[PDB]
Design a binder for this molecule. Sequence first.
Ligand SMILES: O=C(Cc1ccc(Cl)cc1)N1CCC2(CC1)Oc1ccccc1O2
Ligand SMILES: CCCCCCCCO[C@@H]1O[C@H](CO)[C@@H](O)[C@H](O)[C@H]1O
Ligand SMILES: CCCCCCCCO[C@@H]1O[C@H](CO)[C@@H](O)[C@H](O)[C@H]1O
Ligand SMILES: CCCCCCCCO[C@@H]1O[C@H](CO)[C@@H](O)[C@H](O)[C@H]1O
Ligand SMILES: CCCCCCCCO[C@@H]1O[C@H](CO)[C@@H](O)[C@H](O)[C@H]1O
Ligand SMILES: *C(=O)CCCCCCCCCCCCCCC
Length: 328
Amino acid sequence: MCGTEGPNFYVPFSNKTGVVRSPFEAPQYYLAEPWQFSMLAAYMFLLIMLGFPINFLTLYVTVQHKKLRTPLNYILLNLAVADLFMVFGGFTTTLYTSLHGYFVFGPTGCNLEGFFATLGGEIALWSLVVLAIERYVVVCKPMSNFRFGENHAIMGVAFTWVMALACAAPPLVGWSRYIPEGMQCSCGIDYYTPHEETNNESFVIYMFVVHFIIPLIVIFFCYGQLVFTVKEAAAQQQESATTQKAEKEVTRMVIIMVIAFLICWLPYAGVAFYIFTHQGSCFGPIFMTIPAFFAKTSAVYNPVIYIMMNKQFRNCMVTTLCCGKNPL
Ligand SMILES: O=C(Cc1ccc(Cl)cc1)N1CCC2(CC1)Oc1ccccc1O2
Ligand SMILES: CCCCCCCCO[C@@H]1O[C@H](CO)[C@@H](O)[C@H](O)[C@H]1O
Ligand SMILES: CCCCCCCCO[C@@H]1O[C@H](CO)[C@@H](O)[C@H](O)[C@H]1O
Ligand SMILES: CCCCCCCCO[C@@H]1O[C@H](CO)[C@@H](O)[C@H](O)[C@H]1O
Ligand SMILES: CCCCCCCCO[C@@H]1O[C@H](CO)[C@@H](O)[C@H](O)[C@H]1O
Ligand SMILES: *C(=O)CCCCCCCCCCCCCCC
């Protein structure tokens, strides 16, 4: 008796007092004080004011600068579009529902916001995986007579859409489901109930293996071999100071990306290990959704790491903002 069950929800609050209401009908001010709902709204507002300009500016400066429109950058545009799905499909609706105290859009809007907010975050995750594979193929050259062109970059972007749909669509057709999560103002995959009618247990395993373990292994391998190949080639040219300088900056950048991926990855692993063991207590209307609360920020720091620190995008964004010029 941890929470309260309904046909389309699970409110993480005991019902011995008879105060629980459907998160589609009445505010959930027993999960959290009204100011805690407002702080959720403020956090959504922060993500919107930082997420939309950075990600929209990425799409905009690509239009005004021809040198950005290379095939190896196509997957970066896919990342910026994915974050805009998170910004508009997830953060915006949550900011609206949070100020009511409950998900005012009903169960139909729960599937919609759940899908798009999950789709955007899933496109972003696999865009990072695809970019790691692309950089690995271009640098380590595992195929003897291979050149990465426009057709290959399109496959990689289209591949992210298949992977993201592979995660976001099954809950719409009966494998897992979309329910209000945490404070019941946004919607997402049901990791909180063992809903046997939709086989939630198998979907969590599938999510954990395919959309959690596999992305980590691919990123670590590709960048691992990449830094290995770069350091190996740089060792053969120790007389070139720029080669050593290029090797040092490639190492620092791969580290930054791998660390940034783990900052979004480890919270789920920490919640996993606490759910893997300790399977005997109620997770409050918050605990299990703490990784989600911080994984949203990937809509802000991923374009900062992968785009704003790209040498090309930075100068072009300065040029666009710058008007025309820029300090040289
Ligand atoms: O939705 C995503 C997609 C994603 C993928 C990578 C990152 Cl870095 C962030 C989000 N998550 C991952 C897999 C998932 C669900 C949440 O399954 C779990 C089962 C047990 C414990 C934690 C779990 O996390
Ligand atoms: C983008 C900003 C949107 C803000 C929408 C706020 C809508 C508030 O709506 C109000 O909410 C109260 C508590 O939920 C109710 O008691 C009121 O009846 C209702 O009018
Ligand atoms: C940039 C901010 C634009 C805000 C436009 C939001 C329009 C909603 O407007 C709000 O809707 C609520 C519905 O319950 C009403 O209770 C409020 O009185 C009304 O102001
Ligand atoms: C750096 C890694 C980028 C991957 C970001 C994936 C973010 C997806 O995060 C997911 O968002 C959903 C919608 O709010 C929620 O239902 C899930 O609980 C949450 O895990
Ligand atoms: C995908 C995993 C990322 C691999 C990052 C490897 C970080 C290595 O970093 C390098 O290691 C050298 C010793 O091996 C040090 O001497 C160098 O200072 C350092 O640049
Ligand atoms: C050359 O690049 C000309 C740029 C002209 C604009 C420079 C000033 C930008 C100010 C951005 C900071 C806005 C802060 C708003 C916070 C809500």
